[PDB]
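Objective 1.3, modelling of assemblies. Example input:
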Amino acid sequence: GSHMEEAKGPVKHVLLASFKDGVSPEKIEELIKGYANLVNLIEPMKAFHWGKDVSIENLHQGYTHIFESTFESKEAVAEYIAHPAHVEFATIFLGSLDKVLVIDYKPTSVSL
Amino acid sequence: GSHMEEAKGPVKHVLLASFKDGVSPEKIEELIKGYANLVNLIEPMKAFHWGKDVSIENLHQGYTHIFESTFESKEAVAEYIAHPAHVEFATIFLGSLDKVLVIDYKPTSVSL
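Predicted structure (tokens):
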């Protein structure tokens, strides 16, 4: 029980990836399904949900979808990205990636 | 199955726009300034969240930032799109708009 600091942000991470034309569809199944098992292991994650262009599912330059990971420490997010288990997958995805943009989003609304 | 209960929502819309080259800073703040005012004007608007691309050094396509507006649903989005206030600003932004992609992101957790 390391416990560690409690809460921090929370910080929101916005990531978008587009599967190029060549990767099998079934692979995407295990990729998403595998992600569920990945989080089941990756202690540092808390929760991980996905989000695809919901609306017309077309109007887009080629986003495909985005993946957000809930964290309680910007530092922990570092350990996550510095994970071999995750890297193993990201490495496989790289073998067939069309585009990927990693960006961090923080909840900072303006007072009205 | 499924009953009339609040869950899954609301829906989080993600938008990424880039400012063409030759855009002044005073304009950036102006646009962001107006938005805050527009948010106050736009009656239909759960909440307005804004964020900055964390780590622009590298790993980016040129998003710079992303606009995310909270809506009750897809129906509410129609109201936003059917807004003259937003249109007025859109026309102004068009004066210096590079790219604009609309994407919807919803937190969909999977049972582990």
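The first helix of chain A runs from residue 25 to 39.
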